[model samples]
Target: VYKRPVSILVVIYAQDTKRVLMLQRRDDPDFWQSVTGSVEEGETAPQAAMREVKEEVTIDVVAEQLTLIDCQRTVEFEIFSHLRHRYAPGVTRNTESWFCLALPHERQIVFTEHLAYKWLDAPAAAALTKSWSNRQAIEQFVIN
Candidate 1:
């Protein structure tokens, strides 16, 4: 089945430490962003966020009882031309939910879908993201 167009962007950072996790995409090395994935058939936005976080970096928010903050924000944007085929026909845009996960400290990132990962300051992380929405989320998260 084609994937749902609904997705989640999770900005994982260390509480008061100014460190944010940025991932380099396996498909496109220059494409760096935070934890992001599509919402599965039965999952809510936050549920998708948590699952993506674990899948990308082995962070189990539920088991560790970490803090997950829903920014209560969503954005609709045109899906990338090359990736649009993964979605159903005529699905040209994606609705993305923004979230933030706060950790006590930075942990080793175990990459699955991405080629590499970096732990940088929020500003630096935002600067490195290829997606505008991903960058904006990191910037907004630092302010709030």
Candidate 2:
């Protein structure tokens, strides 16, 4: 049996502008989020972040472009119910360590794990993702 490790959700967005990229889960059309994945064995958070970006979007993003925004965010929600198999038995919550990748501007997005992609304005993108913490983080990004 395998257990889910800590992970990072790289909210790829533009700082100079307010556009954010979001993706709809292939399996769950209604579920959407930023580029997200778990840290593989022996990988640093930044390494995992960059790898996930490339794996999910086929975009090579340097670690210098990514900023660590927040960490140890315990996002407890029922959405995890559908993907419980990824975690150990009795695990119901995901303690996600979040990060943000600041692209110069909105770039062409490619989707691999997702069924569709959207380059939306900050508020609209925030509204689309299922996680409150992600929404709040987007809101914070908009303010700064």
Candidate 3:
């Protein structure tokens, strides 16, 4: 009764180098993506975005220091059957809002949570991403 299904999918990239941060999970080496997580209670999507970046990689980014662009888009996708346990019953779909943060250069984050990470150019990042919407987010940045 305490879980909200809404979330934010934030993409952090190097503005100067056009390189994007991606994480590789041991379960799926082929899956690479930027920081992403669910919004905590009473937290806005933007706040969640910043918090996720810090939590995932020890990056302390102030909202004023760097304002992440709200892509003004959302993707609704079905949850993986194994992942549905994290959500409320009958919540099979997740609605994720897109956000983009531009860093000064190719930002590399190393954490022990997953397998490894790589900073790839937007084109390569888009190609390496396994999610439909995450890939779309990268392409949007490339096009825009």
Best by TM-score: 1
**Per-model TM against the reference:** 0.93, 0.82, 0.86
Q: Give me the candidate number with maximum lDDT.
A: 1
Give RMSD (Å) of candidate 3 vs. truth. 2.4
Point out where model 3 deviates above 4 Å.
1-4
Find the 10 residues in a row with the least total lDDT in model 2. 70-79
- Which is better, 2 or 3, measured by TM-score? 3
lDDT, residue 83, model 1: 71
Per-residue lDDT over 14-81 for candidate 3, one digit per residue giving the tens place of the 0 to 100 score: 77878888888665676787777888888899889888777776677784387778889988988767
Window of ten residues with lowest summed lDDT in model 3: 105-114
Candidate 1 per-residue lDDT, tens place, 76-103, comes to 9898787788888899999999998888
Per-candidate Cα RMSD to the true structure, in Å, reads 1.3, 2.8, 2.4
- Candidate 3 lands at a TM-score of 0.86
Q: Cα lDDT of all candidates, in order? A: 0.88, 0.74, 0.79
By lDDT, the better pick of 1 and 2 is 1
lDDT tens per residue, model 2, 15-124: 66778988999867998888888777888777887788889977776634545454434454443667777677777766566777777778777778999888889889
Steric clashes per prediction = 0, 0, 0
Which residue pairs in candidate 3 collide? none
